[PDB]
Amino acid sequence: MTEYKLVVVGACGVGKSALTIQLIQNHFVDEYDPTIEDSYRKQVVIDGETCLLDILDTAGQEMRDQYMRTGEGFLCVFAINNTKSFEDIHHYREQIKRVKDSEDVPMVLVGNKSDLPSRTVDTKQAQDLARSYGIPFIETSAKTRQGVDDAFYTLVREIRKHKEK
Numbered sequence: 104m105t106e107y108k109l110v111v112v113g114a115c116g117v118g119k120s121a122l123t124i125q126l127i128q129n130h131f132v133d134e135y136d137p138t139i140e141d142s143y144r145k146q147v148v149i150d151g152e153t154c155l156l157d158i159l160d161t162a163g164q165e166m167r168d169q170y171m172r173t174g175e176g177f178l179c180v181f182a183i184n185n186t187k188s189f190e191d192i193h194h195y196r197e198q199i200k201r202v203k204d205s206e207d208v209p210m211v212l213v214g215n216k217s218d219l220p221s222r223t224v225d226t227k228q229a230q231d232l233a234r235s236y237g238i239p240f241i242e243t244s245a246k247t248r249q250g251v252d253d254a255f256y257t258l259v260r261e262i263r264k265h266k267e268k
């Protein structure tokens with residue numbers, strides 16, 4: 104069983120906890136406690152490989168540098184109806200680059216809440232940013248579970264592309 108250490112980063116309220124809960128439990132949580140920062144496991148077969156995913160759901164206030172230093176891949180999450188959350192991505196990416204001392208860190212940009220009407224961040228802005236960074240862009244809904252598996256599996260794939268597993 105190969106382990107993958109994943110970290111989910113991004114602003115409060117973008118749906119980090121809700122995505123993580125969906126992947127594991129196939130349940131959408133309407134409110135999940137914003138101060139619960141924890142680590143979750145999921146055994147999944149991806150491309151004929153039994154993976155044990157170790158997902159840190161970041162939370163709390165602004166041991167951290169430990170998961171950040173050793174995490175193999177990062178989900179950088181904004182909400183499509185939260186312009187500030189999107190603007191914040193630059194900071195998360197910068198800081199991840201710093202800790203890894205690398206422009207090439209396995210990462211996926213996730214634009215969540217795709218079910219909500221009238222996005223304030225359009226797919227073009229999100230694609231432009233992902234392209235600049237050399238990373239995939241995936242739109243999700245934790246509410247409906249759409250793109251949720253795609254985000255996490257694509258991250259596992261970006262990790263493999265970077266390093267032997």
Ligand SMILES: CCC(=O)N1CC2(CCN(c3nc(NC4CCN(C)CC4)nc4c(F)c(-c5c(C)ccc6[nH]ncc56)c(Cl)cc34)CC2)C1
Binds near residue numbers: 162191194195196
């Ligand atoms: C509602 C509760 C919830 O859901 N939360 C998730 C939550 C968001 C706030 N968080 C962070 N915020 C800020 N800074 C600010 C100031 C100005 N900007 C523009 C935006 C935020 N920096 C952060 C940061 F640098 C890192 C980080 C990175 C990337 C890389 C290596 C690292 N080593 N050590 C920290 C760190 C991490 Cl991991 C989080 C925050 C932490 C975790 C709280």
Ligand SMILES: Nc1nc2c(ncn2[C@@H]2O[C@H](COP(=O)(O)OP(=O)(O)O)[C@@H](O)[C@H]2O)c(=O)[nH]1
Binds near residue numbers: 132
């Ligand atoms: N419509 C909708 N609401 C969502 C989605 N993801 C999360 N939410 C809601 O947005 C709020 C913040 O979600 P949460 O998962 O706690 O975000 P976090 O602060 O980044 O962990 C919660 O009320 C969720 O129910 C989504 O895809 N769609």
Ligand SMILES: [Mg+2]
Binds near residue numbers: 120161
């Ligand atoms: Mg949370």
